[PDB]
Design a protein around this ligand. Structure first.
Ligand SMILES: CCCCCCCCCCCCCCCCCC(=O)OC[C@H](COP(=O)([O-])OCC(O)COP(=O)([O-])OC[C@@H](COC(=O)CCCCCCCCCCCCCCCCC)OC(=O)CCCCCCCCCCCCCCCCC)OC(=O)CCCCCCCCCCCCCCCCC
Ligand code: BCL
Ligand code: BCL
Ligand SMILES: CC[C@H]1c2cc3[nH]c4c(c3C)C(=O)[C@H](C(=O)OC)c4c3nc(cc4[nH]c(cc(n2)[C@@H]1C)c(C(C)=O)c4C)[C@@H](C)[C@@H]3CCC(=O)OC/C=C(\C)CCC[C@H](C)CCC[C@H](C)CCCC(C)C
Ligand SMILES: CC[C@H]1c2cc3[nH]c4c(c3C)C(=O)[C@H](C(=O)OC)c4c3nc(cc4[nH]c(cc(n2)[C@@H]1C)c(C(C)=O)c4C)[C@@H](C)[C@@H]3CCC(=O)OC/C=C(\C)CCC[C@H](C)CCC[C@H](C)CCCC(C)C
Ligand SMILES: COC1=C(OC)C(=O)C(C/C=C(\C)CC/C=C(\C)CC/C=C(\C)CC/C=C(\C)CC/C=C(\C)CC/C=C(\C)CC/C=C(\C)CC/C=C(\C)CC/C=C(\C)CCC=C(C)C)=C(C)C1=O
Ligand SMILES: COC1=C(OC)C(=O)C(C/C=C(\C)CC/C=C(\C)CC/C=C(\C)CC/C=C(\C)CC/C=C(\C)CC/C=C(\C)CC/C=C(\C)CC/C=C(\C)CC/C=C(\C)CCC=C(C)C)=C(C)C1=O
Ligand SMILES: CCCCCCCC[C@@H](Br)[C@@H](Br)CCCCCCCC(=O)OC[C@H](COP(=O)(O)OCC[N+](C)(C)C)OC(=O)CCCCCCC[C@H](Br)[C@@H](Br)CCCCCCCC
Ligand SMILES: CCCCCCCCCCCC[N+](C)(C)[O-]
Ligand SMILES: CCCCCCCCCCCC[N+](C)(C)[O-]
Ligand SMILES: CCCCCCCCCCCC[N+](C)(C)[O-]
Ligand SMILES: CCCCCCCCCCCC[N+](C)(C)[O-]
Ligand SMILES: CCCCCCCCCCCC[N+](C)(C)[O-]
Ligand SMILES: [Cl-]
Ligand SMILES: [Cl-]
Ligand SMILES: [Fe+3]
Ligand SMILES: [K+]
Lengths: 302, 281, 241
């Protein structure tokens, strides 16, 4: 067989790569972690260094407190018994306050308060992490596309957990922290809003989610197909088009009649992905605020 | 018309069938024997769909729907009006997809590139064939396939899922979803990453792949690298489709009860089955 | 109704987005050409975008696209038909002339640089601290062509320093000179390295590098093109296997 370049045949290693400096405060980088020959068959073998300034510490601490809060509730539900905790793991659930409390913070700990504490910590963890994505880009002189992309994911999450509950008048509308309980929530949400397949924004969100799989299979396959000419060196193919970039375009021109460039395919990419959650969040936000029943709505609007 | 750099690559050769008989282009499109096969299968397909439309009595594309034979037909043939057309259109569809994959192989051979693209595509085709061919055959009837209609196929998704309760509880389906959501996460990151390096802050020099590794290591403590990430996207998206095919091939065949109840095997392991407390005691 | 307003607006946005994306993907290769290299009459309904300029690192200049497209090299091919749409036959040896699947682009004849301005790809012998860390080490193995004959022996791995990966094998020929083989086009086996794309007699014609401790982007393209070309053009010399 031709070698297909999914796994490497030979690994080479050199001194740990401590990274570019540009404007980064080096006092906040760790040393390098270990090298993993296991990862190195597929990607880079090197772990670390990681940058952890104050916003990183904040984000991690908060993320851990989100997790500790949920886990405390789970162990309690398990009667402090480890066997039960493992047995029933996917069944435990930290549930928001009852409708009766609206948007207040008056609910007892065992019945809503703990949920708010958990959400509080999640909110801090995510937004400070969002800040990290901007700031690490800025220190390296780079564009802010990652932070802008991450924001599209934040959008769905904010809508589900915070914006839509606030607009509906109660925390009882937010999502519970539990593996099965959150799946039950999702299912119920569709039923109660007359079936999300009738929400055109849900349909679009699916188009994009499937489309992202289509597109990354296309793109990943294409780059690997032209790796025998250095295709994965995309930045330098952008700066100085090579026969990798030309064979890649012409594959697609000849197949489907049009094609991308090495830079441009990344723009099709970022947008296919980001529109999953952008359209998704619109779809959800409209549900029960403006549209109670997508079936019904669809009968009156095409 | 050609791209500015295209002519040097439009040489003879690479065909799998027909020698040079079909070694040519129409505009940008490569033809080949598989281009002719594709056109034939697609064209016949669309014509049969259109005729089906006429027997439904509509031309609205939001209403046109071609349904497989009813379950009573088993795996036999059915009259055209009542399932036959679906069976023919499925054969045309399959023919067109495989012809498309094989045309892609011819294009690779002419271009001197690897075969990764049509190989990837073959996963999509196998997903399709699981729903319209393999699953219905194992379940004993074409009527278990989905119908070809913009909205009617969505009805089929929903009826098929609710046959087994909340379909969320299918474990292969959970894995499949994980791969889909992870794939889209990976696609956002990769696109943003390359663009952030190609389009730095105003007035600054393009960054380097080294800057891209640095960004990720600074952020999460790890960078998969530029080969890595293309390997990853391909793996994530192909795995998402493999697990999709899997999650349906087992449904109605090896498992056909409510998917939530499958999870009782774990809960009822003997060492903790009867320990009191928790949700299940 | 607010949902109707949002979906209507979304479609308008998505059409403008697609427009914008398609025009961004026309910064290379356009305007479209006739087969003789002159501008085609039908450019499509998308106009070329306004140019952008990339500032290249390390004093290497800028790139402005779209701009004047030109191959900057002779294309040894000729028409085989009196009308548009047919193949173009090589007029000499397509492997030597670099056409078809043997094609290369006139990239810069300088090496690709890393973040620190050092050559990105080096022979491992010149790469401080670099060594094989996993897998069969190919240095020392004889190299076999698709004619099942030995074309030479592996004398080094050329490695990407910043991404810590093997990019080429350097292969010494019967006469003492060396060539680079792309890593993606070799199969490292327990007792040999096998090259499907080239028969042993084609190894000498692999395009050489002008300095033995670096490669230029132009040189990579000639090497990679040539070796890929062999899939098609060495097919006569390729035994069943
Ligand atoms: C209902 C629908 C409503 C319609 C709008 C819906 C979607 C909004 C998106 C607007 C995009 C605006 C971006 C922009 O100005 O372009 C910069 C960008 C240049 O990027 P670059 O060259 O890589 O950056 C150069 C430097 O590095 C400088 O780059 P940098 O690194 O500093 O920043 C990168 C840059 C460009 O980066 C990207 O392109 C990344 C893409 C991800 C963005 C995701 C947005 C996240 C929003 C989350 C909140 C959602 C709320 C719910 C809605 O990002 C931005 O432009 C800033 C975005 C900040 C968010 C703004 C939203 C506020 C709320 O070019 C574009 O993206 C233009 C897009 C064109 C879209 C046209 C839409 C058509 C409109 C209708 C007309 C059609 C008529 C048909 C009949
Ligand atoms: C995969 C699991 C289920 C299923 C579940 C869903 C759900 C759930 C949804 C869709 C949605 C869609 N599905 Mg479906 N769908 C299935 C199988 C298929 C098949 C197939 C031959 O196997 C096709 C062609 C489609 C096609 C479609 C599109 C009509 C629509 C957007 C998809 C998209 O963007 O994908 C990603 C691909 C791209 C972005 C590339 C572009 C593909 C284009 C849009 C395909 C057009 C097809 C055309 C209208 C069909 C006729 C072909 C002609 C006769 C030649 N589905 C199977 C049965 N599908 C969504 C919708 O809005 O439906 C109304 C939606 O919510
Ligand atoms: C019975 C169920 C209903 C249904 C109910 C819903 C509901 C309810 C929702 C969806 C939504 C979606 N559904 Mg639906 N859905 C159904 C049928 C389908 C079918 C199908 C084949 O039948 C498909 C393919 C889909 C597909 C989709 C997606 C397009 C969309 C979610 C996108 C996404 O990326 O979310 C995942 C992305 C996120 C959740 C963003 C997360 C971002 C945050 C910031 C990450 C934080 C991480 C945190 C810090 C933890 C860190 C962990 C670390 C590893 C430590 N649905 C049926 C009809 N669906 C969502 C949507 O947008 O709908 C419009 C939604 O709310
Ligand atoms: C645009 C649409 C898609 C998208 C995009 C997207 N997501 C993103 C981004 C972008 C562009 C980021 O930049 C950001 C990121 O950083 O990615 C690497 C992110 C992100 N998307 C994430 C997840 C995520 N994204 C999802 C979805 C999506 N993301 C969409 C499909 C989903 C789902 C549900 O589909 C999930 C679950 C995170 C990986 C990351 C944001 C991180 C974050 O907010 O973190 C805060 C929480 C913490 C810091 C707590 C972590 C605690 C650690 C585990 C410490 C461990 C120490 C311990 C002692 C170890 C012991 C145990 C070990 C032995 C295991
Ligand atoms: C395996 C991972 C993912 C993937 C990958 C993938 N798809 C691919 C490829 C790859 C690698 C290609 O190379 C190929 C391509 O050319 O893309 C531009 C393709 C392709 N994926 C496509 C679509 C597509 N892929 C999808 C999914 C996926 N593709 C996965 C998520 C989906 C869905 C629903 O999620 C769709 C809709 C096409 C754009 C393209 C293949 C085009 C093709 O086969 O053309 C030849 C056939 C015709 C032109 C028409 C045939 C007409 C039929 C005879 C009649 C129609 C019958 C049909 C069954 C009716 C459907 C009705 C619907 C309402 C349900
Ligand atoms: C880095 O490199 C890369 C490139 O380039 C440098 C690329 O371009 C691409 C390609 C990617 C893009 C251009 C991005 C845009 C693509 C998508 C969003 C994916 C979805 C694509 C479509 C919806 C287009 C579908 C169109 C099709 C399938 C063609 C329709 C065909 C016809 C109307 C003609 C049919 C031709 C036939 C039948 C063959 C024979 C013809 C006869 C006339 C006979 C990728 C992935 C890439 O990684
Ligand atoms: C320019 O280049 C680039 C690089 O280089 C310079 C880069 O570094 C990067 C950066 C990339 C990285 C650092 C890598 C990022 C990693 C990811 C995005 C994700 C990888 C994750 C996986 C491969 C694993 C994901 C796991 C999945 C999909 C499955 C998990 C399934 C479940 C949780 C299912 C539910 C559980 C159960 C138990 C159900 C089933 C149970 C039974 C069957 C029993 C980018 C973006 C890039 O662009
Ligand atoms: C579970 C993963 C999902 C997380 C969800 C959130 C996004 C992902 C993030 Br939040 C996660 Br992956 C990040 C968590 C990582 C926590 C790491 C701990 C940091 C640490 O221990 O540092 C302490 C310590 C102090 O160093 P210092 O004293 O500064 O040394 C001197 C500096 N010098 C050399 C310049 C002089 O550092 C060390 O010495 C040990 C090195 C730490 C190893 C590097 C961490 C590797 C990380 Br955890 C990798 Br494996 C994560 C894997 C990929 C995650 C991908 C997530 C996205 C899908
Ligand atoms: C982030 C993904 C982790 C990848 C880990 C899996 C790699 C296993 C590779 C085995 C391949 C070994 N070999 C010699 C066949 O190439
Ligand atoms: C803060 C807003 C919440 C939005 C949706 C939350 C669903 C979380 C999914 C279950 C997490 C359970 N876990 C990881 C703690 O075990
Ligand atoms: C997302 C909608 C799916 C259908 C899109 C069909 C696009 C066809 C593009 C082919 C272009 C061929 N040509 C010569 C006109 O460039
Ligand atoms: C699959 C390609 C999607 C692009 C097509 C959407 C653009 C149509 C915009 C005009 C439609 C009429 N309307 C209601 C939006 O004004
Ligand atoms: C999902 C949307 C993807 C469809 C994109 C349609 C772009 C068609 C571009 C055809 C133009 C090609 N041309 C003539 C400029 O070379
Ligand atoms: Cl492999
Ligand atoms: Cl019918
Ligand atoms: Fe890429
Ligand atoms: K060395």
């Amino acid at each position: 067989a031709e070698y297909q370049n999914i796994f490497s045949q030979v690994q080479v290693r050199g001194p740990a790569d401590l990274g570019m400096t540009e404007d980064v405060n080096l006092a906040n980088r760790s040393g390098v972690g270990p090298f993993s020959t296991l990862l190195g068959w597929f990607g880079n073998a090197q772990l670390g260094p990681i940058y952890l300034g104050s916003l990183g510490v904040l984000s991690l601490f908060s993320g851990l407190m989100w997790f500790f809060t949920i886990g405390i509730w789970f162990w309690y539900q398990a009667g402090w018994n480890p066997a039960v905790f493992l047995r029933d793991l996917f069944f435990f659930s930290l549930e928001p306050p009852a409708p009766e409390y609206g948007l207040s913070f008056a609910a007892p700990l065992k019945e809503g308060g703990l949920w708010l504490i958990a959400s509080f910590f999640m909110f801090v963890a995510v937004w400070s992490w969002w800040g990290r994505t901007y700031l690490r880009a800025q220190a390296l002189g780079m564009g802010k596309h990652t932070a802008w992309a991450f924001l599209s994911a934040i959008w769905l999450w904010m809508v589900l957990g915070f914006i839509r509950p606030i607009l509906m008048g109660s925390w009882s509308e937010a999502v519970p922290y539990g593996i099965f309980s959150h799946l039950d929530w999702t299912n119920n949400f569709s039923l109660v809003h007359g079936n999300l397949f009738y929400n055109p924004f849900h349909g679009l969100s699916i188009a994009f989610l499937y489309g992202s799989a289509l597109l990354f299979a296309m793109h990943g396959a294409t780059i690997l197909a032209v790796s025998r000419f250095g295709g994965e060196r995309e930045l330098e193919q952008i700066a100085d088009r090579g026969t990798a970039a030309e064979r890649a375009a012409l594959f697609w021109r000849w197949t489907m009649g049009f094609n991308a460039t090495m830079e441009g395919i990344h723009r099709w990419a970022i947008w296919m992905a980001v529109l999953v959650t952008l359209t998704g969040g619109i779809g959800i936000l409209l549900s029960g605020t403006v549209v109670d029943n997508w079936y019904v709505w669809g009968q009156n609007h095409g | 018309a050609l791209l500015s750099f295209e002519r040097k690559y439009r040489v003879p050769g690479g065909t799998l069938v027909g020698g040079n008989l079909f070694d040519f282009w129409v505009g940008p499109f490569y033809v080949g024997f598989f281009g002719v096969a594709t056109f034939f299968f697609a064209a016949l397909g669309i014509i049969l769909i259109a005729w089906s439309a006429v027997l439904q009595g509509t031309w609205n594309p939001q209403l046109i729907s071609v349904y497989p034979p009813a379950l009573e037909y088993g795996l036999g043939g059915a009259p055209l009006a009542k399932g036959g057309l679906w069976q023919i259109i499925t054969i045309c569809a399959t023919g067109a997809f495989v012809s498309w994959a094989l045309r892609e192989v011819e294009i690779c051979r002419k271009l001197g590139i690897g075969y990764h693209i049509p190989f990837a595509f073959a996963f999509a085709i196998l997903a399709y064939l699981t729903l319209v061919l393999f699953r219905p055959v194992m379940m004993g009837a074409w009527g278990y396939a989905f119908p070809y209609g913009i909205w009617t196929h969505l009805d089929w998704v929903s009826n098929t899922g609710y046959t087994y309760g909340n379909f969320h509880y299918n474990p292969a389906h959970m894995i499949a979803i994980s791969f889909f959501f992870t794939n889209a996460l990976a696609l956002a990151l990769h696109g943003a990453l390359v663009l952030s390096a190609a389009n730095p802050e105003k007035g600054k020099e393009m960054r380097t792949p080294d800057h891209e590794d640095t960004f990720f290591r600074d952020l999460v403590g790890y960078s998969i690298g530029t080969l890595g990430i293309h390997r990853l996207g391909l793996l994530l998206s192909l795995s998402a489709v493999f697990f999709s095919a899997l999650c349906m091939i087992i449904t109605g065949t090896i498992w056909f009860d409510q998917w939530v109840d499958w999870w009782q095997w774990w809960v009822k392991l003997p060492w903790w089955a009867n320990i009191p407390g928790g949700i299940n005691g | 109704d607010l949902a109707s307003l949002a979906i209507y607006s979304f479609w308008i946005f998505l059409a403008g987005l697609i427009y914008y994306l398609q025009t961004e993907n026309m910064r290379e290769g356009y305007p479209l050409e006739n087969e003789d290299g002159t501008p085609a009459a039908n450019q499509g309904p998308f106009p070329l975008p306004k140019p952008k300029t990339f500032i290249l690192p390390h004093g290497r200049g800028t790139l402005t696209v779209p701009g004047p497209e030109s191959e900057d090299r002779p294309i040894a091919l000729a028409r085989t038909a009196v009308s548009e749409g047919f193949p173009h036959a090589p007029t000499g040896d397509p492997m030597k002339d670099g056409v078809g699947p043997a094609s290369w682009v006139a990239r810069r004849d300088l090496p690709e640089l890393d973040g620190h301005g050092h050559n990105k790809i080096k022979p491992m012998k010149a790469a401080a601290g670099f060594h094989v860390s996993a897998g069969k080490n190919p240095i020392g193995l004889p190299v076999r062509g698709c004619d099942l004959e030995i074309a030479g022996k592996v004398v080094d791995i050329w490695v990407d320093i910043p991404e810590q990966m093997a990019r080429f094998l350097e292969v010494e020929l019967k006469d003492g000179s060396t060539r680079l083989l792309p890593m993606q086009m070799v199969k490292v086996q327990s007792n040999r390295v096998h090259v499907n794309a080239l028969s042993s007699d084609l190894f000498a014609g692999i395009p050489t590098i002008k300095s033995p401790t670096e490669v230029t982007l132009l040189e990579e393209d000639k090497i990679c093109g040539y070796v890929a070309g062999g899939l098609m053009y060495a097919a006569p010399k390729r035994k069943s296997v």
